[PDB]
Design a protein around this nucleic acid. Sequence first.
DNA 1: AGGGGGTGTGCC
DNA 2: GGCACACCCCCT
Length: 83
Amino acid sequence: HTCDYAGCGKTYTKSSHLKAHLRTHTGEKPYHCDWDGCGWKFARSDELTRHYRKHTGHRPFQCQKCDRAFSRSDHLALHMKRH
DNA sequence: AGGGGGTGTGCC
DNA sequence: GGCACACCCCCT
Ligand code: NA
Ligand SMILES: [Zn+2]
Ligand SMILES: [Zn+2]
Ligand SMILES: [Zn+2]
């Protein structure tokens, strides 16, 4: 599975990863946020899922040193480092 | 400090 | 296919 966009030639082992990679060339953002008044659109479905947590307020990653909770694991990891 | 999007990569 | 981690780079 090779990318035939201009002088690229990037290879992938799965179809889904190449199809998502081609979106970085065509600029297509198929995953729209349906929240009222938002308007954000993303090229990968996981970006929209992560973005929805800002609307829903879901904070699954909880710090065990204090009481702060975060919606993303990297935000919790950085919070633990600079604790 | 907290809070976002972009991107690559490995797993289900 | 999506999910999620990890990291980057940005803004607040
Ligand atoms: Na495939
Ligand atoms: Zn390409
Ligand atoms: Zn939104
Ligand atoms: Zn803490």
